[PDB]
């Protein structure tokens, strides 16, 4: 029951402290180095709804998905959450709406407040 560790042990990685979002290690990377504000970031990635249905994933494009870290190009919890990984660290993160998708969801998989579960692989990052 995939969502399971997470949901019950997962580490509360929001400043606001509100459970927002939670967050797994599965495999710890190498290094010391976590990614910054500004840095390119590579990743693997799928999501999963609360009911289980797999709904977005890098691997259905056959590409890793790459992104700027910190420029809201992603959603708030993966701003956030890939800023805690090291490189190669495969981690699981529960989201709350609030930083998610919100009230409104995002059609036309997503519904109004999702709680939503990701398993998130950093493959790289580079200097901003």
Known sequence: SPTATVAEQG???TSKKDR???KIVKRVGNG???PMIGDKV???YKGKL???KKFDSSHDRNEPFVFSLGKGQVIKAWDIGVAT???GEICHLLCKPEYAYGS???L???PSNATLFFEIELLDFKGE
């Open 32 to 34: 010391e180095e976590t």
């Open 50 to 52: 609360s009911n289980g």
């Open 42 to 44: 590579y990743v693997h």
């Open 104 to 106: 409104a969801g995002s």
């Open 20 to 22: 927002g979002v939670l």
């Open 85 to 87: 990984m090291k490189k």
């Open 108 to 110: 036309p998989k997503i």
């Open 11 to 13: 580490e509360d990685i």
